[PDB]
Ligand binder design. Structure first.
Ligand code: NAP
Ligand code: NAP
Ligand code: NAP
Ligand code: NAP
Ligand code: CP6
Ligand code: CP6
Ligand code: CP6
Ligand code: CP6
Lengths: 249, 248, 243, 250
């Protein structure tokens, strides 16, 4: 039978491209979404038009709270309910906004930024492992974590914690045959709210091509990590950043 | 006038040695503690016997919760109320216990990610908002990239603290606040640990086959807050006897 | 036309596996060797039996010396002469032995360890770029570079230098569309063996040269067109394991 | 009896600052130099005027060659010859110039100079320091920007990366001998003498902490900490002294 993957935040942008490319590869997919119901449903319909019964949606808020463990367990359970197995988890969903140190509550910001970027990946990892071929987890990291944007402390803290998770889970889950790796974009699809002049400023920084990564280029690295061509790779984080992280101030 | 410092988890072990050394250097100290009230008060009394009105205690749980921002604002405020200034913040307090992937898990998240990362972040916000050689020192972990098995939430917290160190160094540089870390390998070993297990850790350390004293950790904190470190920000100094360089 | 690749130290072990997989992928290949002429020619015979005139050999000593720049220019030129193009350079050749700090001359050891592991990759990079589509260079790094083996100072130095070359050349050659990346094995083909295997988290799977070659195939592919300056560890998780 | 230190490339700039601060701390010093004879002697005269017989000069080219091991052995021997002991080695001397990958000295001369001064001579001096053997240590002058390198400086960057590898490998292997091995990694400190003020200001404006380069004494302060008793458990560590520069994105 066909393997099955969960992709978080899969309705739009990079998560959509990952879900598409996994499906093209032969996976059945759970399209997790939070607010983007119409886009999630439209994607599942597109994938099911290609092969019936190969895509479902699953709604969840991945903000940290006392029920986040239950929500994460339910996302994994939704893959077993639909497809009878769960071979790949892709932790893609992520909040991003500034949290300046000097002048939503700050605890809501902690819950959203650390919850989506770190705690939900951790809880999803627990539930993936507990509910258990070529099993693997891919975490969407950030190649610029050590040269961060000013005023983004909580986002940066969350992405650093996700590197720690990737490493710790690779070590702990290797005996169960589950590999755990990361893909670290530099700039890929730019923020919807960002003006054209600012987008071009970011583009001009990238050595390879002076352009952002497509979503498909990011997804290409995810497909490699889940493939049989990566069977001895665990704990690794692949930068897909066009050289951006090597550029000095 | 004498500068003042806040040290979190200062009643015992490394945080106690840091508070002692800061005091010996000339700082007035806030000794934060959670459960260890008798040891925090005994330290305060020792330091005030050495020089009157130079130490106070401040109790707080640094577990993450809806009240943690207020608690961290109150720790910093305690230094201003006692001493009229707050020049140094040492984020030392830390929960450490296994969280296997295969207390509720959300309590473990609150304790391990709150003490190791969120409380340092909120303390950093409160310190900066209240603002000469100002600096913050974060107690990191030199083994964060070769972590102990089954310690994912602790490791996640310590990685998040590296990110805070860097992000806060960059954002607080314009205000003249330096932000750095000290990363022990093994220093004071857990008190429950049998000597046979302690000796196994000691044997791994290239430099002397022995754990760091708390005082050796504190010496790196004293350097980073001193005028000999005035250009250092965003740096994490390993104090690990070469342990992180040892392969499996 | 089919793209072409140079693989250094391609007669045996990892380099041989890389050459085979590039050839299977559709590359024409230059098989570099120093001492292993019989194995280089045996490999070329196997590859040419599959597709005629798709594999040649090239002899060079990659020890640093006054003639190393000309040797490296000749390896690159051999690819252009055989195949009319040179799309991929894999810097695989490497010397490995201990050089204790406290007690071949030490300067011969510098020439071999630093020359084969770092300087010849630098000179090959220069010649590859100067003679220039999906162009890329892949350097064989070491996943244990920051947890080095005791008494291997010069080997470790040269592998660190190779990381610096990977990064510096990625930046400088990006405007030319040449990507520069690394693959960092941990324990692959062993030179006591069991001791090492039991420490690898993914130790249920034997380490293989083909697994290393798979990462090289990804990095040279169109699936890696935005990837430059990246070093992929292929080590079963070994570098995550504390002492 | 006062401890003794060797500082390479100590006639001017950062290496002079390091020699001066070690001397102020109580060390006797060997001021190594290559071409800067007048500045080396000037400095040793100043230090000797402060306390007699506490500074000597030693001349040596640190370019790689088949004689480099003998030169490095001789530098260490000069410390024992003058002072009877050698407690600290500071590997400061360093060539720096561009070596573009795509197109005067031959490339092999550039290799010998850039990799010799930045890496091979530190390795040979480390071997001779250890063989000739309490608070013994080595400090290597690294570069905080080694992972965000300047365009066209590949050989310099390769040499600094190799020096990180040496720092770590020598820390591990020399720990049983009680010799600590650490690094200090400037971002921008004293700017090139050839650089125009406009270009210097471009660099200064990038630095978060103060929008200025490190003084030479700020770099020396980190060296003095690492050789001190306050660092007695620290080995294999590289301290950035960079004002936050390495944290700044493109
Ligand atoms: N784009 C880049 O250049 C870039 C650069 C560096 C790293 N990355 C990483 O790559 C991944 C994909 O980036 P992207 O730009 O495609 O991300 P994005 O568009 O900013 O976010 C992806 C999705 O995350 C989901 N999400 C946000 N908050 C959530 C919450 N509270 N609960 C559950 N889901 C939530 C949202 O789903 P709904 O729309 O359904 O609400 C959203 O569509 C992220 O991890 C990002 O950090 C991207
Ligand atoms: N010891 C080592 O070898 C070592 C190795 C690597 C890193 N480090 C780091 O170095 C720092 C000091 O280490 P240590 O061994 O001295 O630490 P420790 O003894 O484990 O803990 C220090 C103090 O943290 C406070 N703490 C724990 N949970 C708390 C909470 N919920 N709220 C507030 N405070 C809390 C406790 O204060 P009360 O007693 O008052 O409750 C405790 O005494 C830590 O950050 C540790 O991670 C140490
Ligand atoms: N095996 C592993 O586990 C492992 C681990 C970490 C990193 N790596 C990296 O992976 C790559 C391939 O490793 P491997 O074990 O397959 O290497 P290997 O067999 O030790 O050597 C590869 C080839 O390099 C060539 N070589 C050595 N010294 C030379 C010189 N002076 N001039 C020219 N060529 C020379 C030799 O070719 P000839 O036989 O023709 O003379 C040799 O067959 C290396 O860069 C290595 O450092 C491997
Ligand atoms: N300045 C900075 O901003 C900065 C930034 C990053 C790293 N660093 C590192 O910090 C250290 C000191 O920097 P600096 O700017 O003071 O260095 P520098 O002025 O460029 O060079 C220091 C000395 O190196 C000696 N040297 C050069 N080539 C030599 C050779 N072939 N043989 C022997 N000695 C040789 C020269 O001695 P003579 O004059 O006697 O010939 C020179 O005075 C260097 O390792 C540098 O890489 C500095
Ligand atoms: C808002 C898009 C976004 N979402 C998430 N989850 N993470 C990010 N790192 C970004 C991001 C992308 C490009 C730039 Cl230039 C800045 C931030
Ligand atoms: C329990 C002491 C402790 N507390 C905290 N906060 N962090 C740690 N990293 C440790 C610790 C020290 C030595 C060993 Cl061997 C293991 C863990
Ligand atoms: C001789 C094989 C070899 N050659 C080179 N060129 N580099 C290496 N790192 C090794 C190697 C492989 C396995 C072990 Cl355990 C140690 C070293
Ligand atoms: C020429 C001074 C110099 N010498 C050496 N040995 N290394 C360096 N890294 C520099 C240097 C300092 C500042 C700038 Cl901006 C650029 C280079």
């Amino acid at each position: 039978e066909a393997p099955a993957a969960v992709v978080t935040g899969a309705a739009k942008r990079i998560g959509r491209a990952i879900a598409v490319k996994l499906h093209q590869t032969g996976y059945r997919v759970v399209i997790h979404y939070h607010n983007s119901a119409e886009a999630a449903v439209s994607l599942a319909d597109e994938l099911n038009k290609e092969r019936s019964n190969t895509a479902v949606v699953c709604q969840a808020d991945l903000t940290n709270s006392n029920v986040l463990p239950a929500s994460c367990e339910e996302i994994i359970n939704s893959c077993f309910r639909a497809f009878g197995r769960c071979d790949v988890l892709v932790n893609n969903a992520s909040a991003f906004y500034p949290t300046p140190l000097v002048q939503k509550t700050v605890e809501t910001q902690v819950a959203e930024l650390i919850g989506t970027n770190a705690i939900a990946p951790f809880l999803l990892t627990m539930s993936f492992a507990q509910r258990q071929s070529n099993l693997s987890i891919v975490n969407l990291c950030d190649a610029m974590v050590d040269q961060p944007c000013m005023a983004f402390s909580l986002y940066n803290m969350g992405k650093h914690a996700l590197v720690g998770l990737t490493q710790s889970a690779a070590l702990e889950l290797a005996p169960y045959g589950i590999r755990v790796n990361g893909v670290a974009p530099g700039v890929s699809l730019l923020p919807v709210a960002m003006g054209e002049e600012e987008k071009d400023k970011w583009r001009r920084k990238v050595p390879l091509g002076r352009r952002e990564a497509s979503a498909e280029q990011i997804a290409d690295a995810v497909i490699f990590l889940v493939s049989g061509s990566a069977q001895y790779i665990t704990g690794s984080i692949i930068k897909v950043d066009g050289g951006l992280s090597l550029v000095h101030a």
